[PDB]
């Protein structure tokens, strides 16, 4: 192995594993057993579950990048793993979008958010999010096979444009727009009296969260669109697929960073975790 992109992706993946596994485990344990089952908890539990599923799926990507193809497992592994990975990542993205939507809704509808707002609604929304993620995951479950190739055969695969465009839309446009609009509206609403002391801390948190989310996923989708745009069997395409590994590494680092930027801001939760640890 002699290439900058592969070693860079390996280093980034190792850092993501080391910085994500303990934090995700601690947050899940605290918010599942040590803490209560309040309304705001369900979002954190589901998000951390998706992120830890991604972290546990990371070793498959690390092993594949170590060999660069030549899938040593059977058909079922190549049919399952690069579908569970997509399921976990898109569940995390949709949970972040739902968190932002809830944060805006609890502000703009104060009278309504006290009567019809309980744990059951949160569970229903999480279930619907999981169902939508599973539906988005289905198309990759029926379009995978193994090429015969040489003795070492690499597993993988017209519908590419449709699947990639749908992925781009539903995972980049609506989530980012929803997050930006919701956080901007919260910042605007938090500057109408009795909150003048605030709007210097809400604004910082909102902008840092949006910036992290937008910077940890934009190159991945730009490269995904470029793969469609650039014809194969071209050196530019070769570098494109080479840096796709770094794009995946950044996408996983997003899930690694999510617990630090979402669960730890709950001062009570971090205090309880510090007491436990």
């Amino acid at each position: 192995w002699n290439e900058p992109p592969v070693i860079l992706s390996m280093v980034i993946l190792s850092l993501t594993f080391l910085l994500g596994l303990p934090g995700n485990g601690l947050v899940l344990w605290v918010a599942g057993l040590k803490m209560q089952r309040t309304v705001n908890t369900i979002w954190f539990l589901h998000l951390t579950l998706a992120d830890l599923l991604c972290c546990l799926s990371l070793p498959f990507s690390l092993a594949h990048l170590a060999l660069q193809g030549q899938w040593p497992y059977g058909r079922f592994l190549c049919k399952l793993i690069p579908s569970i990975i997509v399921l976990n990542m898109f569940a995390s993205v949709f949970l972040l979008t739902a968190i932002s939507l809830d944060r805006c809704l609890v502000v703009f509808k104060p009278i309504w958010c006290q009567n019809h707002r309980n744990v059951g609604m949160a569970c229903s929304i999480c279930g619907c999010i999981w169902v939508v993620a599973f539906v988005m995951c289905i198309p990759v479950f029926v379009y995978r096979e193994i090429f015969t190739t040489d003795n070492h055969n690499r597993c993988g695969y017209t519908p590419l444009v449709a699947i990639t465009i749908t992925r781009l839309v539903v995972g980049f446009l609506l989530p980012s727009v929803i997050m930006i609009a919701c956080y901007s509206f919260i910042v605007f609403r938090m500057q109408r009296g009795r909150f003048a002391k605030s709007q210097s801390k809400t604004f910082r948190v909102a902008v840092v969260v949006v910036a992290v989310f937008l910077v940890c996923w934009t190159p991945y989708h730009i490269f995904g669109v470029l793969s469609l745009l650039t014809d194969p069997e071209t050196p530019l395409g070769k570098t494109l697929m080479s840096w796709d590994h770094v794009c995946i590494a950044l996408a996983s680092a997003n899930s690694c960073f999510n617990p630090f930027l979402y669960a730890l801001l709950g001062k009570d939760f971090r205090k309880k975790a510090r007491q436990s640890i």
Binding site: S61, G69, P82, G224, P232, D244, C247, I248, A251
Partner: peptide, 10 residues
């Protein structure tokens, strides 16, 4: 058609 190889993700 053609040959297209990805490291999961996609």
């Amino acid at each position: 058609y053609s040959f297209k190889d990805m490291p999961l993700x996609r």
